[PDB]
Scaffold this active site. Structure first.
Site, mmCIF file in Angstrom:
data_model
loop_
_atom_site.group_PDB
_atom_site.id
_atom_site.type_symbol
_atom_site.label_atom_id
_atom_site.label_comp_id
_atom_site.label_asym_id
_atom_site.label_seq_id
_atom_site.Cartn_x
_atom_site.Cartn_y
_atom_site.Cartn_z
ATOM 1 N N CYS A 1 2.224 3.985 -5.471
ATOM 2 C CA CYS A 1 1.184 2.903 -5.325
ATOM 3 C C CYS A 1 1.687 1.780 -4.403
ATOM 4 O O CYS A 1 2.630 1.043 -4.483
ATOM 5 C CB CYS A 1 0.839 2.248 -6.559
ATOM 6 S SG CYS A 1 -0.520 0.720 -6.467
ATOM 7 N N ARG B 1 1.300 -2.543 -5.585
ATOM 8 C CA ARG B 1 1.914 -2.930 -6.795
ATOM 9 C C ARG B 1 2.392 -4.442 -6.882
ATOM 10 O O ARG B 1 2.650 -5.040 -7.947
ATOM 11 C CB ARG B 1 3.036 -2.099 -7.111
ATOM 12 C CG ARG B 1 2.907 -0.784 -7.825
ATOM 13 C CD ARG B 1 4.056 0.225 -8.014
ATOM 14 N NE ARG B 1 4.493 0.556 -6.797
ATOM 15 C CZ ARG B 1 5.786 1.256 -6.497
ATOM 16 N NH1 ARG B 1 6.680 1.256 -7.562
ATOM 17 N NH2 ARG B 1 5.976 1.726 -5.517
ATOM 18 N N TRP C 1 -8.812 -2.296 -6.071
ATOM 19 C CA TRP C 1 -9.704 -2.244 -4.786
ATOM 20 C C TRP C 1 -9.201 -1.388 -3.497
ATOM 21 O O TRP C 1 -7.940 -0.691 -3.809
ATOM 22 C CB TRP C 1 -9.683 -3.693 -4.207
ATOM 23 C CG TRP C 1 -8.592 -4.489 -3.798
ATOM 24 C CD1 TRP C 1 -7.805 -4.340 -2.806
ATOM 25 C CD2 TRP C 1 -8.140 -5.534 -4.867
ATOM 26 N NE1 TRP C 1 -6.868 -5.250 -2.939
ATOM 27 C CE2 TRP C 1 -6.948 -5.764 -4.308
ATOM 28 C CE3 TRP C 1 -8.550 -6.065 -6.111
ATOM 29 C CZ2 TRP C 1 -6.197 -6.894 -4.894
ATOM 30 C CZ3 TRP C 1 -7.591 -7.071 -6.690
ATOM 31 C CH2 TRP C 1 -6.584 -7.314 -5.747
ATOM 32 N N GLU D 1 -7.815 4.443 3.270
ATOM 33 C CA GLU D 1 -8.146 5.552 2.160
ATOM 34 C C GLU D 1 -9.535 6.097 2.640
ATOM 35 O O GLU D 1 -9.830 7.384 2.612
ATOM 36 C CB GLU D 1 -8.312 5.095 0.737
ATOM 37 C CG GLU D 1 -6.890 4.386 0.384
ATOM 38 C CD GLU D 1 -7.059 3.944 -1.244
ATOM 39 O OE1 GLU D 1 -6.952 4.713 -1.991
ATOM 40 O OE2 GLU D 1 -7.062 2.682 -1.421
HETATM 41 C C1 HEM Z 1 -5.403 -3.897 -6.551
HETATM 42 C C2 HEM Z 1 -5.322 -3.023 -5.562
HETATM 43 C C3 HEM Z 1 -4.799 -1.700 -5.263
HETATM 44 C C4 HEM Z 1 -4.738 -1.173 -3.948
HETATM 45 C C5 HEM Z 1 -4.976 -1.918 -2.612
HETATM 46 C C6 HEM Z 1 -4.091 0.077 -4.263
HETATM 47 C C7 HEM Z 1 -3.457 0.901 -3.293
HETATM 48 C C8 HEM Z 1 -3.204 2.414 -3.684
HETATM 49 C C9 HEM Z 1 -2.978 3.281 -2.504
HETATM 50 C C10 HEM Z 1 -3.521 3.276 -0.874
HETATM 51 C C11 HEM Z 1 -2.704 4.623 -3.068
HETATM 52 C C12 HEM Z 1 -2.692 5.843 -2.513
HETATM 53 C C13 HEM Z 1 -3.818 6.844 -2.990
HETATM 54 C C14 HEM Z 1 -4.218 7.820 -2.320
HETATM 55 O O1 HEM Z 1 -3.910 8.052 -1.188
HETATM 56 O O2 HEM Z 1 -4.799 8.620 -2.980
HETATM 57 C C15 HEM Z 1 -2.633 4.131 -4.585
HETATM 58 C C16 HEM Z 1 -2.230 4.974 -5.410
HETATM 59 C C17 HEM Z 1 -1.802 4.894 -6.990
HETATM 60 N N1 HEM Z 1 -2.259 3.759 -7.495
HETATM 61 FE FE1 HEM Z 1 -2.634 1.972 -6.624
HETATM 62 N N2 HEM Z 1 -3.860 0.136 -5.758
HETATM 63 C C18 HEM Z 1 -4.367 -0.774 -6.290
HETATM 64 C C19 HEM Z 1 -4.580 -1.142 -7.857
HETATM 65 C C20 HEM Z 1 -3.878 -0.057 -8.584
HETATM 66 C C21 HEM Z 1 -4.137 -0.255 -10.154
HETATM 67 C C22 HEM Z 1 -4.913 -1.430 -10.937
HETATM 68 C C23 HEM Z 1 -3.452 0.703 -10.567
HETATM 69 C C24 HEM Z 1 -3.321 1.202 -12.229
HETATM 70 C C25 HEM Z 1 -3.270 0.316 -13.145
HETATM 71 C C26 HEM Z 1 -2.835 1.546 -9.501
HETATM 72 C C27 HEM Z 1 -2.136 2.618 -9.759
HETATM 73 C C28 HEM Z 1 -1.908 3.668 -9.088
HETATM 74 C C29 HEM Z 1 -1.316 5.167 -9.063
HETATM 75 C C30 HEM Z 1 -0.869 5.737 -10.452
HETATM 76 C C31 HEM Z 1 -1.256 5.834 -7.802
HETATM 77 C C32 HEM Z 1 -0.957 7.222 -7.590
HETATM 78 C C33 HEM Z 1 -1.771 8.031 -7.760
HETATM 79 C C34 HEM Z 1 -1.800 9.549 -7.500
HETATM 80 O O3 HEM Z 1 -0.674 9.989 -7.370
HETATM 81 O O4 HEM Z 1 -2.899 10.161 -6.869
HETATM 82 N N3 HEM Z 1 -3.246 1.062 -8.457
HETATM 83 N N4 HEM Z 1 -2.811 2.848 -4.718
HETATM 84 C C1 LIG Z 2 -4.993 18.048 -6.476
HETATM 85 N N1 LIG Z 2 -5.575 17.324 -5.614
HETATM 86 C C2 LIG Z 2 -6.618 17.830 -4.600
HETATM 87 C C3 LIG Z 2 -5.402 15.722 -5.650
HETATM 88 C C4 LIG Z 2 -4.339 15.246 -6.230
HETATM 89 C C5 LIG Z 2 -3.991 13.947 -5.961
HETATM 90 C C6 LIG Z 2 -4.750 13.199 -5.153
HETATM 91 C C7 LIG Z 2 -4.386 11.643 -5.065
HETATM 92 C C8 LIG Z 2 -5.622 10.988 -5.291
HETATM 93 N N2 LIG Z 2 -5.019 9.471 -5.521
HETATM 94 C C9 LIG Z 2 -6.471 8.703 -5.570
HETATM 95 C C10 LIG Z 2 -5.998 7.440 -5.978
HETATM 96 C C11 LIG Z 2 -5.422 6.947 -7.312
HETATM 97 C C12 LIG Z 2 -5.185 5.428 -7.548
HETATM 98 C C13 LIG Z 2 -5.631 4.579 -6.786
HETATM 99 C C14 LIG Z 2 -5.292 3.277 -6.837
HETATM 100 C C15 LIG Z 2 -6.016 2.125 -6.071
HETATM 101 C C16 LIG Z 2 -6.471 2.816 -4.772
HETATM 102 N N3 LIG Z 2 -7.064 1.793 -3.863
HETATM 103 N N4 LIG Z 2 -6.755 3.960 -4.725
HETATM 104 C C17 LIG Z 2 -6.296 4.963 -5.606
HETATM 105 C C18 LIG Z 2 -6.642 6.341 -5.002
HETATM 106 C C19 LIG Z 2 -5.837 13.809 -4.465
HETATM 107 C C20 LIG Z 2 -5.928 15.087 -4.489
#
Ligand code: HEM
Ligand SMILES: CN(C)c1ccc(CCNCc2ccc3ccc(N)nc3c2)cc1
Ligand code: HEM
Ligand SMILES: CN(C)c1ccc(CCNCc2ccc3ccc(N)nc3c2)cc1
Ligand SMILES: C[C@H](O)[C@H](O)[C@H]1CNc2nc(N)[nH]c(=O)c2N1
Ligand SMILES: C[C@H](O)[C@H](O)[C@H]1CNc2nc(N)[nH]c(=O)c2N1
Ligand SMILES: [Zn+2]
EC number: 1.14.13.39
Lengths: 404, 406
Positions: free
Chosen positions: A108, A111, A280, A285
């Site tokens: 993330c 953070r 947000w 993305e």
């Molecule tokens: C507040 C604005 C936030 C922004 C701008 C942000 C940004 C991002 C971005 C760009 C990613 C990469 C996701 C992807 O490429 O699919 C991500 C992943 C992630 N975010 Fe954040 N995030 C935010 C809030 C949060 C919140 C509120 C949570 C949980 C309480 C969170 C937890 C996570 C987790 C666990 C991942 C990894 C998910 C995965 O492995 O697919 N984020 N975030």
């Molecule tokens: C297995 N596959 C198809 C798969 C597994 C993980 C992913 C990553 C999805 N991550 C989405 C994600 C999770 C948390 C977020 C928190 C904030 C934000 N702006 N985007 C967020 C976006 C995508 C595809």
């Protein structure tokens, strides 16, 4: 011993000592590094140790370690596990745990915001209909007419020998993907499978590129139920471009709220199989991955052609040029609609500040370089030049199997 | 499933298992507890030499389909005997050629490996002076530059030897622009090269004061102080940068040299160490247009170009950096093409690397690859490698980093 961590732009050096708090194996070994992998390949004394560790994290956080309340609480947990094989968190502990899980999430980039998280306790949920109500309220709260607020809603923890509460959709807002017999896909190809699950559970499908899906919500050991979200709850932003007038004619749009709903939340050994959370969007993305990935909307060539670019050869950098304008349109359109969004330069700058906060607070910060670095303009952002150490801390968000 | 790393391409949904990684005899920086893959640099006994040597000879005889043969076993004995009486051994010419190619093939950070079988190996193991190293290096440059039709090449100088000093090229590359520290603390030229620039001066070089002053070479023969050699300017092909539509870009006076010739890496084959073995290929456009020209700690021209483009540099959300970077990369590509000097864009390069991965899957059962280094520094997910999971591990023969000789 402990990893020396260097920033190559600044020449500055830190040492990560936080990684010693990791109790969970990643996928790397001395023989080979597997850090680019998206998903992991695959008693009471164990639960008790995870529980004590978490209660200890908690009381340290309120600076009350060794207090009477601290010792009594450990006894409560001990007593409950010993008698029942599990235990339960207090709301304040759950609030702390949810924030820590976000804070500990190495992928993330957002953070810096980790301490600002609205936590809705939905552990008194007994049915899919009740889950729907909590989800609608979550969306209304987090959306906030475009002034997005980060939030999490936590449904009842997993219990032994009982099915899990699950939300089947990977996000609360997903566009349908309809698989043609002509091979192609209309809509979002990432959602072909979920779209099909919905239809066979009685959803009457549309035929558009941006049809918002119903939710499949599952209460324990019951078939999932279908709930259509009230359209006024789902804020969307039509995409236009600040100078390219034709862009709006592409009929593109995206939704405001990124609300992820298929991850498992682990706190003190307890597992929350439905705990959707939202923040947000970072603009890349949508503008880069969702719209330009060849296995998503794949709009690069269309936009390139509208821009009258030379599509014949790679060396015209038509792909790069189109992508940039697409990201600009996303930023422009969200800004126009007064919907919260952050560009990849601003986001990575804040993350650098976060790394520094975390160095002083905890002596390190787990981070996944391949995920922190944005999918366009990588080395143009400060995080490209920053070495990072990746490891698993708990509380944690984890992937979990699809419930079908 | 198979007890080897499963590797997925998320664009295509395709799956492979890497069995080649089982051949790694050298550990990397990672552990089950923490991944250190994003680190740039993480941290003989005859018995030890011998097993590395036997392994390499085995690799050589496999590569020529004579594994188990009489000539295979005789070569083993011969190597065992040579180490037995001298403490070291020597490679046959064809072994050196095979090893040099295999080191390149094995380099996890190289996106250009589709070319690995096309490498001209110049044997310079007879070199006995710094003057002679210079002659060899000039010849390399002429051959490899080939008036713009670049040809991959490596020149191999004598190996490390017991009780004797190393052959070393002190410069990181055969072509490097000077970096002059100013009184205001800024740098004129390439800040990457401040240290080598000052070493050149300490060693008698009369310094210029340009942004693109080509450095002389500091060449070190065994147990001798390094000697200074100026490259004849006609040997050093450079490309003035212009942009296909932005007419002012040529007025910026930017340029880059044609030949990426890396000279400070150690080539290790069968336990033998070649401390001086400069090699060269051709550039991928992002190396110049993105990193060398736009890194904040390099030439850092992003804001200057953005001002010429009349962009809003006061806010991140204008994407002025992204826009300027794209035009700079395009200028590099356009200028090299105009000048008829070999170059590859980051799309073509990554596409060919995907082909390379498939070749190696069938040939060897895997391909060691450093994702962070393979994915280009602009337009990451627009290239196919972004969506390709990779396995990283150290195989020998190998190119390795080595301490600066000073
Ligand atoms: C507040 C604005 C936030 C922004 C701008 C942000 C940004 C991002 C971005 C760009 C990613 C990469 C996701 C992807 O490429 O699919 C991500 C992943 C992630 N975010 Fe954040 N995030 C935010 C809030 C949060 C919140 C509120 C949570 C949980 C309480 C969170 C937890 C996570 C987790 C666990 C991942 C990894 C998910 C995965 O492995 O697919 N984020 N975030
Ligand atoms: C297995 N596959 C198809 C798969 C597994 C993980 C992913 C990553 C999805 N991550 C989405 C994600 C999770 C948390 C977020 C928190 C904030 C934000 N702006 N985007 C967020 C976006 C995508 C595809
Ligand atoms: C033929 C065209 C070639 C292309 C397009 C190419 C491309 C690249 C690129 C873009 C990098 C990343 C370098 C950086 O970002 O600093 C790289 C690294 C590397 N290349 Fe290749 N290369 C080519 C030929 C060669 C040859 C001939 C060799 C050796 C015989 C070689 C060996 C290596 C090694 C060892 C690295 C790792 C560099 C390091 O760790 O500092 N390459 N290559
Ligand atoms: C410790 N420092 C300052 C440092 C460490 C590694 C590097 C990596 C340099 N790699 C350059 C390099 C190496 C081989 C190449 C082969 C072909 C090509 N086109 N470019 C190539 C470029 C730079 C600086
Ligand atoms: C194979 C590779 O690990 C995979 O494509 C990753 C790369 N980095 C990423 N980074 C982010 N933010 N999101 C992603 O989905 C991915 N995908
Ligand atoms: C911190 C990080 O490892 C460092 O900036 C790396 C990232 N990826 C890279 N990739 C390439 N090709 N070249 C590099 O110098 C780097 N630098
Ligand atoms: Zn690793």
């Amino acid at each position: 011993k402990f990893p020396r961590v260097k920033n190559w732009e600044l020449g500055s050096i830190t040492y990560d000592t936080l990684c010693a708090q990791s109790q969970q194996d990643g996928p790397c070994t001395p023989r080979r590094c597997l850090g680019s992998l998206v998903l992991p390949r695959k008693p009471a004394e164990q639960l008790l140790s995870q529980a004590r560790d978490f209660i200890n994290q908690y009381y340290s956080s309120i600076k009350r370690s060794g207090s009477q309340a601290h010792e009594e609480r450990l006894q409560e947990v001990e007593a409950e596990v010993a008698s029942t094989g599990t235990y339960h968190l207090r709301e304040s502990e759950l609030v702390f745990g949810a924030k820590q899980a976000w804070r500990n999430a190495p992928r993330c980039v957002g953070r810096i915001q980790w301490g600002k998280l609205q936590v809705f306790d939905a552990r008194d949920c007994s049915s899919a209909q009740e889950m729907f109500t909590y989800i609608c309220n979550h969306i209304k709260y987090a959306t906030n007419r475009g002034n997005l607020r980060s939030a999490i809603t936590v449904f009842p923890q997993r219990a032994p020998g009982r099915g899990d509460f699950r939300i089947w959709n990977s996000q609360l807002v997903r566009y349908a993907g309809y698989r043609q017999q002509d091979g192609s896909v209309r809509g979002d190809p990432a959602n072909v499978e979920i779209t099909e699950l919905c239809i066979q559970h009685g959803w009457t499908p549309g035929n558009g590129r941006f049809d918002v899906l119903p939710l499949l919500l599952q209460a324990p050991d019951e078939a999932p139920e279908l709930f259509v979200l009230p359209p006024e709850l789902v804020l969307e932003v039509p995409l236009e471009h600040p100078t390219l007038e034709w862009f709006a004619a592409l009929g593109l749009r995206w939704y405001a709220l990124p609300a992820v709903s298929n991850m498992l939340l682990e706190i003190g050994g307890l597992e929350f199989s439905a705990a959707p959370f939202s923040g947000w969007y970072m603009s890349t993305e949508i503008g880069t991955r969702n719209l330009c990935d060849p296995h998503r909307y794949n709009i690069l060539e269309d936009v390139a052609v509208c821009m009258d670019l030379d599509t014949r050869t790679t060396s015209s950098l038509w792909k790069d040029k189109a992508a940039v304008e697409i990201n600009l349109a996303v930023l422009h359109s969200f800004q126009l609609a007064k919907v919260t969004i952050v560009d990849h330069h601003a986001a990575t700058v804040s993350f650098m500040k976060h790394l520094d906060n975390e160095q002083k607070a905890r002596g390190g910060c787990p981070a996944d370089w391949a995920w922190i670095v944005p999918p366009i303009s990588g080395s143009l952002t400060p995080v490209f030049h920053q070495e990072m150490v990746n490891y698993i801390l708990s509380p944690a968000f984890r992937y979990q199997p699809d419930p079908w």
